UniProtKB/Swiss-Prot annotation, chain B:
Listed name of the protein: THO complex subunit MFT1
Function comment: Component the THO subcomplex of the TREX complex, which operates in coupling transcription elongation to mRNA export. The THO complex is recruited to transcribed genes and moves along the gene with the elongating polymerase during transcription. THO is important for stabilizing nascent RNA in the RNA polymerase II elongation complex by preventing formation of DNA:RNA hybrids behind the elongating polymerase.
General remark: Present with 5910 molecules/cell in log phase SD medium.
Compartments it resides in: Nucleus
Quaternary structure (record): Component of the THO complex, which is composed of HPR1, MFT1, THO2 and THP2. Together with SUB2, TEX1 and YRA1, THO forms the transcription/export (TREX) complex. THO associates with DNA and RNA in vitro.
Swiss-Prot record, chain C:
Underlying gene: HPR1
Quaternary structure and interacting proteins, as annotated: Component of the THO complex, which is composed of HPR1, MFT1, THO2 and THP2. Together with SUB2, TEX1 and YRA1, THO forms the transcription/export (TREX) complex. THO associates with DNA and RNA in vitro.
Function: Component the THO subcomplex of the TREX complex, which operates in coupling transcription elongation to mRNA export. The THO complex is recruited to transcribed genes and moves along the gene with the elongating polymerase during transcription. THO is important for stabilizing nascent RNA in the RNA polymerase II elongation complex by preventing formation of DNA:RNA hybrids behind the elongating polymerase.
Protein location: Nucleus
This protein's record includes keyword Manganese: no
UniProt main location, coarse: nucleus
Cellular component GO terms, alphabetical: Cdc73/Paf1 complex; chromosome, telomeric region; nucleoplasmic THO complex; THO complex; THO complex part of transcription export complex; transcription export complex
Protein keywords: Nucleus, Phosphoprotein, Transcription, Transcription regulation
GO biological process: DNA recombination; mRNA 3'-end processing; mRNA export from nucleus; positive regulation of transcription by RNA polymerase I; positive regulation of transcription elongation by RNA polymerase I; transcription elongation by RNA polymerase II; transcription-coupled nucleotide-excision repair
Protein name, UniProt field: THO complex subunit HPR1
Length: 59, 146, 414, 237, 149
């Protein structure tokens, strides 16, 4: 969770079966990977021009 | 079961255990020669059959080196410790002197103490003001009345 | 240079270098120059290990020189100026005889081995002497004693037989103003606090094995004290909550759909200060001025920032009952909680009791505490007073108000 | 002792005279006279305690006043708006205190870690600055934790001992609610190089063998429940 | 032997006499074990020197015990005993009390900043129509009021 990926990569490189113990490891790894990839993804399939529509209704 | 006398007797031996290696060494050199010279006066002599050292004058020089070294080491050991006694004593007298004259340092402490009280004064004041402005805004909000 | 008495000086080679280096250190020490020569020699003896006849014999040599120079330092000023060296080259101390460095985190020194056999005794002598002053101690002295205890504690491993005390409950815990400035409601408050402090917190063991007069005595002394202190803490948190509630009600009734959250109450810096810059600069100037007053060689004889001074009654009263400075009451509550934890475990566990009985006996085969006589009329009153103060009042109080001191005391007790 | 000639006659003669009996205990070789096995055992213990013990108090109830002050001071640091620019004053205060009442280094590091982890959320900035300037910070062998070739070199092994200890206590009921914050504080420390990773990994509770056993059990149970399958009872029995 | 320093000095003087005797004994020993008449005179000088070395040694051990006792007697004097004669207690008490007041006032001031502070109402109105959601913590007071505060 705290953004230190290299220890856990080096551990799961040795004992892959550990992933069977709990699901949350996959979800968190996906979180860090998705943050890694997001800015490349916005540069293509351009949604930045369409980013200017996430606003709330005024009371 | 041990009586009060015996317990006090072990306590005194513990309170005095000293392990000064420089000293024990010089006394040992004195002994390794007193046992040999004392034996020669007796005339027992012999080629070191017992542990009385060896007459062969080839280690007499080895004894001469040891006598110069152990003695010099002991001389330094005591010279060092007396310097430490002189220093720690001087430092203890120095702190006592600073204790005698402290009246010269009351003014600066008094000054910071007073300066801090003024700072607390102003902050407590500003807090009263925030309570007054909030109360006037409350009045204003609740209906109309000016 | 000499290299002339080759046959003569062949007898004892290593010892000769040792004595001449010792004399060098001594005559140079008796500064910013002598310290330089001494440090260079002390490093030289490390670097010249392989050439020595008996390579292991460097250990007892190196340490030796070290001790000598520790003796010759003039005053704790010089000692603090010199220590960063000995803290730089620790990993050289840890290898008693091996000529190859040890893995970081493993030490091969023992309390009774040849290197430390006299050095630990000597440094414990120096620590005891520095502790024995107790009146004329400048802050330099306390800093020096700390540096020394930390060095020695880091040398030996955590597990050695002489690196954790064997159950010595510390006497001489007084916080008075060292017999200086030592002297209604103030006087009775002072007497009551003094009595309970001494009899309960100075010696939890005795106040755990009593004759049922002692227990009830300290209870009849303690009760009103805690009553008054908790009333005061209640006033404190009442002021806080009143301020926050009034502000929240106003800010809620002043907006459209705010609906403030009454739950959270953690303190936050006010808005007109979290974004100013003149006030921050002024506060920093003041803190710098005060700090410069503190760390100056003219004022090295001050008391710590949290002493309570049981001696001067009126100062004690001004300290405990103020309604704006609550840290002193936190100290008192923490002390009671610690001691009561120990007393409860002592009474109930009946297993640590054996250990403490053994420890008390071994140092003194003649004693008077029962250690067995816990009939039940006593046991009851003791384990009742404990569960009363430690749990019924304190935790029940700080479970609704300030739920962070709560976790603190619970974690520390466990 | 000085003359050339002697024997056990001196031992006997000294055993006879009771007047200077204590002077003999003081200075000479008196291992003989104090012969009661109880006496010599008491002697061994009293020597090893009074001469070679460190005389320091490392359990909270041992030096109550002492720890009291320290922990109170620590709370102050987290309730100070300008706490960030007064790190050095706090370190000097803590050293002054640890000096006065002879607290230990190990236990005091632990006391800092606990009441720090209690505020870690929104205190982590000042916490890390404080530990960065204190001399309990490995400055010449700082761990990396971001380079495959150095996941086990450097750190401050004493902090590693205390942390690996406090991370294996999940048996009582009070620590089960603070394990989260404590683990988060260690995870913060474990990336600024305070301790190397493997020094923590190798020493927490579930050993690698028990982990592998649980893994084999889960593998077999999963494979069976997959291939064979299980009938979910709808109206069965 | 009244003081620790003076007893150490007496011990040093006792060391020197022993050293001279020992060195002379060693040289006579070399002459005797050297590869008659000169050897006969030496074989008598050696007992003459013996009626001296043991007596001198005797004294060295005696002084060692003397010095140990004095050191222990000095180490019993605690800090309180030495400061019994300070001439002016008053100033000492005034100075110490002053420090206690300064410590307590500092805690109140620091407590009284973030922990016991009292702040503004936070009424909010935003001019830009674009702002559709407001943080409610970035609200600040008007610049004119800020100068007065």
């Amino acid at each position: 969770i705290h953004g230190c990926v290299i220890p856990v990569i080096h551990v799961l490189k040795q004992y892959p079966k550990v992933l069977y113990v709990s699901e949350s490891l996959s979800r968190y790894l996906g979180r860090v990977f998705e943050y890694l990839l997001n800015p490349l993804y916005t540069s293509m399939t351009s949604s930045g021009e369409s980013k200017d529509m996430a606003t709330a209704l005024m009371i | 079961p041990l009586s009060q006398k015996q317990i006090d007797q072990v306590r005194t031996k513990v309170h005095y255990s000293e392990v000064d290696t420089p000293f024990n060494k010089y006394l040992d050199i004195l002994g390794k020669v007193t046992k040999l010279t004392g034996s020669i006066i007796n005339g027992t002599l012999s080629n070191d059959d017992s542990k009385i050292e060896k007459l062969t004058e080839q280690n007499i020089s080895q004894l001469k080196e040891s006598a110069h070294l152990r003695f010099l080491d002991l001389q330094s050991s005591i010279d060092t410790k007396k310097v430490a006694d002189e220093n720690w004593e001087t430092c203890q007298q120095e702190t006592l002197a600073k204790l005698e004259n402290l009246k010269d340092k009351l003014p600066d402490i008094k000054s910071i103490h007073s300066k801090l009280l003024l700072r607390i004064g102003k902050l407590q004041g500003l807090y009263d003001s925030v309570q007054v402005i909030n109360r006037e805004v409350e009045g204003l909000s609740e209906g109309r009345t000016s | 240079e000499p290299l002339e008495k080759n046959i003569s000086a062949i007898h004892d080679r290593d010892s000769l270098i040792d004595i001449i280096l010792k004399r060098f250190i001594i005559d140079s020490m008796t500064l910013e120059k002598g310290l330089l020569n001494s440090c260079i020699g002390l490093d030289f003896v490390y670097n010249s290990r392989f050439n020595r006849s008996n390579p292991a014999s460097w250990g007892n040599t190196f340490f030796e020189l070290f001790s000598t120079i520790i003796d010759l330092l003039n005053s704790p000023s010089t000692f603090l100026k010199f220590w960063p060296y000995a803290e730089s080259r620790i990993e050289w101390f840890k290898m008693n005889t091996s000529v190859e460095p040890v893995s970081l985190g493993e030490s091969n020194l023992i309390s009774y081995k040849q290197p430390l056999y006299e050095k630990l005794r000597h440094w414990n002598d120096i620590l005891a002497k520095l502790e024995n002053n107790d009146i004329l101690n400048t802050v330099k002295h306390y800093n020096m004693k700390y540096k020394l205890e930390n060095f020695l504690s880091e040398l030996l491993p955590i597990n050695e037989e002489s690196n954790f005390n064997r159950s010595a409950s510390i006497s001489a815990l007084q916080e008075s103003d060292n017999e200086w400035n030592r002297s209604s409601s103030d006087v009775i408050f002072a007497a009551d606090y003094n009595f309970v402090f001494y009899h309960l917190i100075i010696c939890p063991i005795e106040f755990a094995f009593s004759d049922l007069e002692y227990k009830n005595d300290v209870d009849r002394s303690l009760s009103p004290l805690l009553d008054a202190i908790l009333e005061i803490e209640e006033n404190f948190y009442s002021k806080i909550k009143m301020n926050n509630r009034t502000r929240y009600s106003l800010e809620e009734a002043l907006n459209t759909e705010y609906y403030a959250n009454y739950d959270v109450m953690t303190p936050k810096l006010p808005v007109y200060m979290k974004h100013s810059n003149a006030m921050k600069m002024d506060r920093n100037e003041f803190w710098a001025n005060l700090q410069n007053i503190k760390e100056s060689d003219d004022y090295t004889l001050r008391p710590t920032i949290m002493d309570i001074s049981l001696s001067n009654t009126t100062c004690l009263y001004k300290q405990l009952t103020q309604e704006d400075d609550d840290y002193y009451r936190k100290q008192f509550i923490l002390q009671l909680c610690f001691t009561t934890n120990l007393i409860r475990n002592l009474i109930s566990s009946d297993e640590t009791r054996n250990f403490y009985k053994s420890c008390y006996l071994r140092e003194n085969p003649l004693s008077d505490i029962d250690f067995e006589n816990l009939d039940e009329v006593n046991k009851k009153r003791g384990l009742n007073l404990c569960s009363y103060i430690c749990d019924n009042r304190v935790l029940k109080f700080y479970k609704i108000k300030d739920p962070d001191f709560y976790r603190v005391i619970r974690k520390l007790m466990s | 002792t000085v003359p050339n000639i002697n024997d056990l006659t001196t031992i006997s003669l000294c055993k006879l005279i009771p007047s200077l009996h204590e002077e003999l205990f003081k200075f000479s070789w008196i291992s003989s006279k104090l012969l009661n096995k109880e006496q010599t055992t008491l002697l061994r213990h009293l020597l090893k305690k009074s001469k070679y013990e460190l005389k320091k108090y490392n359990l909270l109830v041992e030096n109550s006043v002492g720890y009291g002050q320290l922990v109170a001071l620590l709370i102050l640091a987290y309730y100070d708006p300008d706490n960030f620019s007064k790190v050095s004053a706090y370190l000097k205060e803590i050293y002054h205190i640890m000096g006065k009442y002879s607290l230990d280094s190990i236990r005091t590091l632990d006391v800092i870690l606990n009441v720090s982890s209690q505020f870690i959320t929104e205190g982590y900035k000042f916490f890390i600055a404080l530990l960065r300037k204190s001399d309990s910070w490995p400055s010449s062998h700082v761990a990396n934790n971001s380079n495959y070739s150095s996941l086990n070199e450097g750190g401050n092994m004493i902090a590693a001992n205390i942390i690996s200890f406090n991370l294996s206590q999940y048996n009582e009921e009070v620590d089960k609610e603070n394990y989260e914050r404590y683990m988060d504080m260690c995870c913060i420390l474990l990336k600024n190089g305070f301790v190397n990773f493997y020094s923590i990994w190798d020493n927490v509770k579930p050993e690698m063998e028990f982990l592998q056993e649980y893994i084999q059990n889960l593998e077999t149970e999963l494979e069976e429940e997959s291939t064979k399958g299980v009938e979910n009872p709808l109206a069965m029995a | 032997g009244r003081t620790y320093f003076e007893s150490l000095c007496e011990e040093e003087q006792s060391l020197q006499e022993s050293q001279t005797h020992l060195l002379n004994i060693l040289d006579i020993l070399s002459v005797l074990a050297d590869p008659d008449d000169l050897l006969t005179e030496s074989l008598k000088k050696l007992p003459d020197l013996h009626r001296e070395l043991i007596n001198s040694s005797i004294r060295l051990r005696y002084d060692k015990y003397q010095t140990r006792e004095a050191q222990l007697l000095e180490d019993t004097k605690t800090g309180r005993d030495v400061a019994a004669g300070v001439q002016n207690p008053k100033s000492i008490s005034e100075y110490y009390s002053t420090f206690e007041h300064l410590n307590r006032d500092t805690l109140r001031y620091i407590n009284l900043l973030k922990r016991l502070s009292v702040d503004l109402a936070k009424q909010v109105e935003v001019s830009d129509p674009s702002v559709t959601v407001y943080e409610m913590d970035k609200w600040v007071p008007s610049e004119k009021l800020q100068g007065i505060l």
